[PDB]
Design a protein around this motif. Structure first.
Motif, short mmCIF file in Angstrom:
data_model
loop_
_atom_site.label_atom_id
_atom_site.label_comp_id
_atom_site.label_asym_id
_atom_site.label_seq_id
_atom_site.Cartn_x
_atom_site.Cartn_y
_atom_site.Cartn_z
N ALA A 1 0.75 7.65 2.44
CA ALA A 1 -0.67 8.02 2.50
C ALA A 1 -1.49 7.16 3.46
O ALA A 1 -2.72 7.24 3.43
CB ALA A 1 -1.26 7.95 1.10
N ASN A 2 -0.83 6.37 4.31
CA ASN A 2 -1.51 5.39 5.18
C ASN A 2 -0.78 5.20 6.51
O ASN A 2 0.44 5.36 6.59
CB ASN A 2 -1.58 4.02 4.49
CG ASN A 2 -2.57 3.97 3.34
OD1 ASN A 2 -3.77 4.05 3.55
ND2 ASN A 2 -2.06 3.82 2.12
N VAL B 1 -11.72 5.06 5.98
CA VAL B 1 -12.24 6.41 5.80
C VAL B 1 -13.69 6.30 5.33
O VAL B 1 -13.97 5.55 4.40
CB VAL B 1 -11.39 7.23 4.79
CG1 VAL B 1 -12.04 8.59 4.51
CG2 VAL B 1 -9.98 7.43 5.33
N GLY B 2 -14.60 7.00 6.00
CA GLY B 2 -16.02 7.02 5.63
C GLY B 2 -16.89 5.88 6.14
O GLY B 2 -18.07 5.82 5.79
N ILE B 3 -16.35 4.99 6.98
CA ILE B 3 -17.14 3.85 7.49
C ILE B 3 -18.20 4.28 8.51
O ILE B 3 -18.07 5.34 9.13
CB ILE B 3 -16.28 2.71 8.10
CG1 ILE B 3 -15.58 3.15 9.41
CG2 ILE B 3 -15.31 2.18 7.05
CD1 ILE B 3 -14.83 2.03 10.12
N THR C 1 -6.25 2.96 -1.88
CA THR C 1 -5.94 4.12 -1.04
C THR C 1 -6.65 5.39 -1.51
O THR C 1 -7.29 6.07 -0.71
CB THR C 1 -4.41 4.34 -0.96
OG1 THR C 1 -3.80 3.23 -0.31
CG2 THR C 1 -4.07 5.62 -0.20
N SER D 1 -6.48 4.22 5.09
CA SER D 1 -7.34 4.72 4.00
C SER D 1 -8.60 3.86 3.81
O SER D 1 -9.65 4.37 3.41
CB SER D 1 -6.59 4.83 2.68
OG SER D 1 -6.08 3.57 2.30
N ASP D 2 -8.49 2.57 4.12
CA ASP D 2 -9.60 1.62 3.99
C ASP D 2 -10.74 1.82 4.98
O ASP D 2 -11.82 1.28 4.76
CB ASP D 2 -9.11 0.17 4.14
CG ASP D 2 -8.01 -0.18 3.17
OD1 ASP D 2 -8.05 0.30 2.02
OD2 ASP D 2 -7.08 -0.92 3.57
N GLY E 1 -8.54 9.18 9.77
CA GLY E 1 -8.30 7.75 9.94
C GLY E 1 -7.33 7.50 11.09
O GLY E 1 -6.23 8.06 11.12
N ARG F 1 0.81 -1.21 0.00
CA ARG F 1 0.00 0.00 0.00
C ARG F 1 0.85 1.27 0.00
O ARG F 1 2.01 1.26 0.42
CB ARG F 1 -0.95 -0.02 1.21
CG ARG F 1 -1.78 -1.31 1.34
CD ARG F 1 -2.69 -1.54 0.14
NE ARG F 1 -3.71 -0.50 0.04
CZ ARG F 1 -4.86 -0.47 0.72
NH1 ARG F 1 -5.19 -1.44 1.57
NH2 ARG F 1 -5.68 0.56 0.54
N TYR G 1 -9.28 -3.08 -1.96
CA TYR G 1 -8.89 -1.94 -1.15
C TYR G 1 -7.96 -1.03 -1.94
O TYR G 1 -6.94 -1.47 -2.47
CB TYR G 1 -8.18 -2.44 0.10
CG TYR G 1 -9.06 -3.24 1.02
CD1 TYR G 1 -10.12 -2.63 1.70
CD2 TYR G 1 -8.85 -4.60 1.23
CE1 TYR G 1 -10.94 -3.35 2.55
CE2 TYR G 1 -9.66 -5.33 2.08
CZ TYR G 1 -10.71 -4.70 2.73
OH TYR G 1 -11.51 -5.41 3.59
N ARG H 1 -12.97 1.72 -1.54
CA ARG H 1 -13.25 0.28 -1.50
C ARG H 1 -13.98 -0.16 -2.77
O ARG H 1 -14.74 0.61 -3.35
CB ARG H 1 -14.10 -0.06 -0.26
CG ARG H 1 -13.37 0.16 1.07
CD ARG H 1 -14.30 0.04 2.27
NE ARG H 1 -15.20 1.19 2.37
CZ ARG H 1 -14.95 2.34 3.02
NH1 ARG H 1 -13.81 2.53 3.68
NH2 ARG H 1 -15.87 3.30 3.02
#
Ligand SMILES: NC(=O)c1ccc[n+]([C@@H]2O[C@H](COP(=O)([O-])OP(=O)(O)OC[C@H]3O[C@@H](n4cnc5c(N)ncnc54)[C@H](O)[C@@H]3O)[C@@H](O)[C@H]2O)c1
Ligand SMILES: NC(=O)c1ccc[n+]([C@@H]2O[C@H](COP(=O)([O-])OP(=O)(O)OC[C@H]3O[C@@H](n4cnc5c(N)ncnc54)[C@H](O)[C@@H]3O)[C@@H](O)[C@H]2O)c1
Ligand SMILES: NC(=O)c1ccc[n+]([C@@H]2O[C@H](COP(=O)([O-])OP(=O)(O)OC[C@H]3O[C@@H](n4cnc5c(N)ncnc54)[C@H](O)[C@@H]3O)[C@@H](O)[C@H]2O)c1
Ligand SMILES: NC(=O)c1ccc[n+]([C@@H]2O[C@H](COP(=O)([O-])OP(=O)(O)OC[C@H]3O[C@@H](n4cnc5c(N)ncnc54)[C@H](O)[C@@H]3O)[C@@H](O)[C@H]2O)c1
Ligand SMILES: [Mg+2]
Ligand SMILES: [Mg+2]
Ligand SMILES: [Mg+2]
Ligand SMILES: [Mg+2]
Lengths: 344, 333, 335, 334
Positions: A213-214, C283-285, B47, C280-281, C240, A209, B45, B51
């Protein structure tokens, strides 16, 4: 019995992998009397390596002159040979007088693979800039460099996180006794992560990933393998990492149960008493940018210490900073210098 | 029509996502350099693009997307890919390593594919198509075509609108561009020899070259040799903007330039007067989004310099254009 | 339909508004901030981390229209001077960050004002602090001011409660690796709250900082009162976050047993995943808390166990989802 | 040995203080901001982009000591109420961003106040605007309020002056790709200045925004008055910027001729490089402007030329270096 050489007796070193650790090790070696780099091996031309030495995003411009030549480059007038040999077995280290190799590619971090440097017309000894497996002596300078006698052919400088954790954990052990503990390192992203989401060559679905950015969870062996550096902590620790978007600079948290009861003040005092060139001490409320380029392997932060007492039981939290680049490199070069002097 | 994807990367995976909502095309084969588990996870997934809209489940030799199996292979050479085993007629060549007529043609062999769409510039001897600007140059007999670059799909409709309305004498382009996968995450040896892409891409403003303005003649013949430009790559993971500074044959005002762009607007070329930023164009379906707030016309001693600016998501803007071209190409094949 | 007001159209205020578009029987008729309608309308339409607004937004005199429906905007600095009742508003979301106490939040309640207030933050020990699907049963409807807790509390609470209910918790320490927020400086400069770490560039540093979530957990889960403490490491993602808890338990456990307990506790507020995801996975949940089974550890040394449990949360949308659930429930039992 | 005050101990104020430590004949005896000494001392010691302070800093009552020397700190919101003369201060660096005009900067000048002010920003058309080594010869020493210009002006000016002197400039357009700054929001929220783009998360977006550097170039280079315009694209780096200028010239030129002209114009303020550098490489430099010969273009189409010239600048330290040069000179001739 070690009969160390004086720093006037110059030991010639080779670097395999002129990457983040290799280039910064080269930089620090410029200020070490008695060690000098005469051969660099990577996978590219001298111009690329010369440019990357000169200009450095996180660690600043090179302190000196760098000029490209045929088959190498000159650093402050002194020529350094560059080769582009993919296999350690095919590098002729002895041509340039190289006795000891800094193995810093990330691809030959075991006894058997590092020993490929040792052959006829090759090097005599190898320092792996990473964990090298459980059968290689693993040194954190000023914690356990006294285990070296100089007859070793392959040694490990450990990881960045081990060099951070070791003096902090050792201080806890010596003062209070450690029963067990769990480590989290909040860590800068590194070159083994993808710049953007894509197939990771090592099969890691998280390092696949976008690293800048994470928040990226990932494994580390530092806490599990601490027994190689501090035998009395063997099997007592485990941990993991959270990799985050800073290009260098990291911090290690350890939550532990101790044999003795303690206060925040007693824990901080123990760390301050344990301070030296490798293990620093601060009470300033600093952030990661403040530790970029430091020479401490580990910098204990007294502002983050916690001792939670509930029904007679204590959990203790200790936190130390480290520039995963320069903190580690400073320790590595201290170990290389010492190893070069006692080498037999 | 059944499609194959070589290189299940940023463009490959987003092309797959868009193809889920296109009747005329479906993906039956993906080729890359890894196992199905890696590719399935990267589809699920994302970034910057969010999703996946559906279910993905890993199987032996592939994965199921909403119940439908897609075969995965790990064949490094295009010549060795048996595309015809999965009915694949057209290949999206999206690896970045086979972007020429000769190298893309390796897909075309006995038990291979019939046609290839290169997801990048493919040389002067391959038809280069920006959808809704010049997709009428296709007749359907072509073996290899190019979907151009991200920046070309942004620049083309904007430059074409300037040309048709006012006439273009010459111009210089600067694209302020998201960092991409050809840059190093941290300072290290760049395998293409580029001393600037060698640098930490998410921590620097990085100048770099681009061929979009120089090669614009392949899309808009009347602008051949009239433009040049370069890029400034900056720390956002996707989303970009193209500035063109040009001299025109006719005198203009800011309002006349903006009105021309609005009149040229369609599914590919968008128009906005909102003072947006790069995060606002992530995931859009326009190939190019003209921004009227950034227009300038500088008049000094009778002479004019004209500045026009358009946004694009180098990922989803380009991918939307690519899939429009793929759909149209598949229908007339 | 219960008519709601928003004080502070910020990150939480705007996302609360967005979620309320998909809740039948609650609608926002009044927004109050410190700016003009054009600024607020633009910030509703365009959102860096949470994406473009799903609908139409058009600026008008004294407000803006959302899908054709007018929402009044005012720029009143003092809560006492807001005439909420004019627009039918009974309950206020207090989301400025400046009135997070019983006395300050009560200023909304006056003649021609609101009837009740939900603070979008910790609100003191004399205000009921609710994490939806953990302790919303403490509300009877007669309260004037309540708290939705913090983002970290809504993450931590269902994870800690699951440990307590299944195994018993002796004590624990929490670290949240957290997105930077609007209380940090964009570049190094004087911090108006006197915090020498929030003074530093928030998107260019790992920044240690304090949090009350673990220390104040007794307000939500009484049986864990005084048993936890913790802190935060704020890092360069714009939203996040993730919460790690290292705890000692009254029962011996395995990794598999801990993960099974979390899966059994899963609901609309507390999610469960075994996918190796990154920030990032999430975000928005819509989950307040998303347990990650891949990060669980049980370290056994000489018979003694340390247990690590980790849960994701979008400090923005995860919290806002919990907030709106609490607002809706509080509105419909209101007396 | 002239005694200086700093109003606004911010990015420019703190770095100005740092540079002044290595300038003999100027010293800071008073700092004014809106906070306690402990906050300001910490911010001097530790700096995200510019590194740890080279020296000792220790907090005291009403100020702090730097290498053993006390510097007074006050928290006075109004310039009129600052008693600069108490600490011997003659010249004030006005670096708050809130008093960047003649009338507002003059508030520092009163009985028991300062004698002169240098605004660390554009100060309007009625204030002398100085880029050091481009037009510092317009100062005579009798001025009460001067401007050090903007960061972008100090970058643009020597590059545009070199084009004018060698070739003649008809017109041009500027784009500066600029680091985010403290007038942007850390995350999306109401911008106090009413700017809908600076309202957005500055470290997560490419953000278009206005600048005055090209439009107002006439204040620095009179012969370029009204000939340029431009704008900015603010991007996610915490400091470090680059200015591109696309221009039409009165003479035909080659890339080599343009680069040679820039090299011949090089000095302490205007640097020259042929290395393919990036923004991190210019963080902390002392040039006001660093011309990059690798980015030069000359496009010839049907006999007509567009010329592109590009110069780097650390909007923080490049500007500050120029500001302290101008302050030092202004102090000597006062
Ligand atoms: N970066 C850190 O924070 C850090 C800290 C401590 C330890 N380490 C360790 O140091 C090593 C290097 O890490 P790094 O971050 O410097 O990596 P890097 O990617 O920056 O450097 C690796 C270098 O090795 C070269 N290389 C790769 N394969 C080669 C081969 N077969 N022959 C010759 N050269 C080859 C590459 O071209 C590159 O220049 C790894 O073992 C890593 O785990 C890194
Ligand atoms: N990302 C953008 O903004 C963008 C926009 C327009 C065009 N493009 C073009 O699209 C292409 C891909 O770019 P990207 O950003 O998606 O790259 P990427 O690195 O994200 O994807 C490349 C993929 O190709 C695979 N691959 C590499 N060698 C292979 C081989 N021999 N066989 C099979 N698979 C192989 C890799 O594993 C990877 O998954 C390039 O030509 C690029 O110029 C990219
Ligand atoms: N952002 C998060 O992750 C998060 C999560 C949970 C809770 N919270 C809490 O929610 C609250 C708001 O946080 P945020 O991130 O949305 O902050 P923010 O800065 O984005 O929002 C604050 C808003 O309040 C407005 N405002 C300020 N003073 C005002 C006044 N006197 N009257 C009216 N409006 C005023 C501001 O203009 C701004 O629009 C805080 O209490 C915070 O702790 C935030
Ligand atoms: N940062 C740059 O890149 C840059 C470059 C060139 C010029 N400038 C100019 O320099 C000035 C400052 O910019 P900056 O980036 O250093 O800003 P900053 O926000 O970092 O510094 C401003 C400082 O002024 C203080 N302040 C605010 N109001 C005050 C008041 N009434 N009285 C006293 N102190 C007060 C603040 O507390 C803060 O410490 C502006 O005019 C700006 O345009 C900035
Ligand atoms: Mg030496
Ligand atoms: Mg389909
Ligand atoms: Mg509703
Ligand atoms: Mg001095």
């Amino acid at each position: 019995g070690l009969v160390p050489r004086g720093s006037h007796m110059v030991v010639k070193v080779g670097i395999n992998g002129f990457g983040r650790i290799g280039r910064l090790a080269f930089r620090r070696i410029q200020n070490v009397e008695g060690v000098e780099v005469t051969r660099i091996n990577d996978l590219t031309d001298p111009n690329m390596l010369a440019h990357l030495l000169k200009y450095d995003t996180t660690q600043g411009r090179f302190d000196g002159t760098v000029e490209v030549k045929e088959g190498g480059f000159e650093v402050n007038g002194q020529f350094v040979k560059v080769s582009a040999e993919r296999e350690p077995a095919n590098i002729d280290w002895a041509t340039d007088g190289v006795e000891i190799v800094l193995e810093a590619t990330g691809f030959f971090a075991s006894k058997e693979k590092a020993e490929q440097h040792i052959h006829e017309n090759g090097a005599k000894k190898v320092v792996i800039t990473a964990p090298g497996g459980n059968d290689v002596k693993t040194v954190v300078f000023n914690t356990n460099h006294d285990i070296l006698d100089g007859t070793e052919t392959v040694i490990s400088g450990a990881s960045c996180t081990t060099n951070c954790l070791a003096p902090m954990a050792k201080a806890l052990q010596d003062n209070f006794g450690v029963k067990q503990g769990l480590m989290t390192t909040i860590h800068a992203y590194t070159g083994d992560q993808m710049i953007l989401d894509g197939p990771h060559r090592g099969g890691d679905l998280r390092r696949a990933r976008a690293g800048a950015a994470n928040i990226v969870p990932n494994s580390t062996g530092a806490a599990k393998a601490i027994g190689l550096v501090i035998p009395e902590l063997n099997g007592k620790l485990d941990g993991a990492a959270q990799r985050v978007p800073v290009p260098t600079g990291s911090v290690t948290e350890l939550v532990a149960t101790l044999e003795k009861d303690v206060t925040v003040e007693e824990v901080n005092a123990a760390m301050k008493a344990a301070a030296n060139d490798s293990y620093g001490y601060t009470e300033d409320p600093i952030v990661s940018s403040d530790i970029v380029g430091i020479s401490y392997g580990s910098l204990f932060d007294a502002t983050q210490t916690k001792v939670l007492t509930v029904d007679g039981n204590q959990l203790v939290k200790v936190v130390s900073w480290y520039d995963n680049e320069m903190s580690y490199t400073s320790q590595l070069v201290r170990t290389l210098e010492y190893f070069a002097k006692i080498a037999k």
